[PDB]
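Quick one before lunch.
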Amino acid sequence: GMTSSFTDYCKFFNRILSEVQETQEQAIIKGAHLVSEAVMNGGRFYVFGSGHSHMIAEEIYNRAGGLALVTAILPPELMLHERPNKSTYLERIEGLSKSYLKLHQVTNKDVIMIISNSGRNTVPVEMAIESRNIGAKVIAMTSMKHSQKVTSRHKSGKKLYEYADVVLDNGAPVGDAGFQIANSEIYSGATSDSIGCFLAQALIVETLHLLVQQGFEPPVFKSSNVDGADLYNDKIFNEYVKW
Amino acid sequence: GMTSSFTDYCKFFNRILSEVQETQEQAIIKGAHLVSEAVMNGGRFYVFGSGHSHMIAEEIYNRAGGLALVTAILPPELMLHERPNKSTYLERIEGLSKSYLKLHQVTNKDVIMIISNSGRNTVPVEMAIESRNIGAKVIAMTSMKHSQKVTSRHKSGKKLYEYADVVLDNGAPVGDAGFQIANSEIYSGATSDSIGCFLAQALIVETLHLLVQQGFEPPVFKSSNVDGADLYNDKIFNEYVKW
Ligand SMILES: [Mg+2]
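Model of the magnesium ion complex:
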């Protein structure tokens, strides 16, 4: 009768996560220094991704344990829900990222994290370029494997990682679907968002640690089950959230 | 802990992930049977979550390694980007899920996965009730710890997991921000989405594995780096993607 892929997929996943945990500590720390420095300087933390990568922006925005100084840049035209494949077309268009930075009034006091697995398209690369132009620090989350292997589709000829102050490597294999289904040529089990979400939280957790060590009391959304969560959350929403 | 939280956060996280992997295998297998049987019987796999939970639907929808018979139900009004807190309010409203189900013409041949940490609010509970009433199979992804501790806000006085054919436990602690920022009262490091994504992926992998074993050749999107990826993808999109 039928066998199970679960043990195998767990092992596949756990290796990637191990390697990530083992190799990204220094990056996480340097990224957290960038973010904490910005916060302490009156700055914000902008987060952006295109396609599926946008979920890492969502992940650290407006939730329990969430730093209220985080603003997700979430253009729905680059998401998944308006029409299938729309975001694939738009990712190639020059001038979008620059408009977005303008709309959100990102300044040189700020930090931005840009998530892209391949880091090869116009939108994410432009976002890094225009951010540098503004003078904001850039964190890139990416698949260093995938991205090193691909050719830029941005006019610079460069990739996202090549414009970052700090790179966070999600460890995803080239393709982001690297688990081969037994007795077939079918590949699945993408790791970029699971591991990407882990890393995004680790960054925030590290940032908060750095702030606390320094005697900064950062605005962080309390989970409903803590006493007085709501009144506190309403207070800090009002004082802090920029969308 | 003195300077960095990263090692501690990894341990914290790996603990939860280990527990999830140690315990959810039978539930993964059961869910994959539901989905694989539906697929072979002319059905689809719908996926839905409110608030941050929506990203789990996104995760297995329209992507490399993705099963083309997955349709995410993604009402923007219950996402994060329109305005802050809108999803929180709307999740408590009667009648939305019944509309969504109609709009997506969900039928008795299908399966639906509903993701909610607490599983206590009207939207996900109403969705679960109506989906079984139609005749669909229901998979719930929830935090069993959180869900069991809280009272239901739905008029039936029951919770999401109580209405599902299979439950996936994301292992998240009550409140979903359980990691203490060393030597403060600040808590962070939400795990429901990182672990949630891994679970969604494990389910699909297992579903594909069951299908291949039964000689069914499923439509799975190929990644960019694969030969013929784009034609094949257009083909299966055209044949299968409903939205
Ligand atoms: Mg999303």
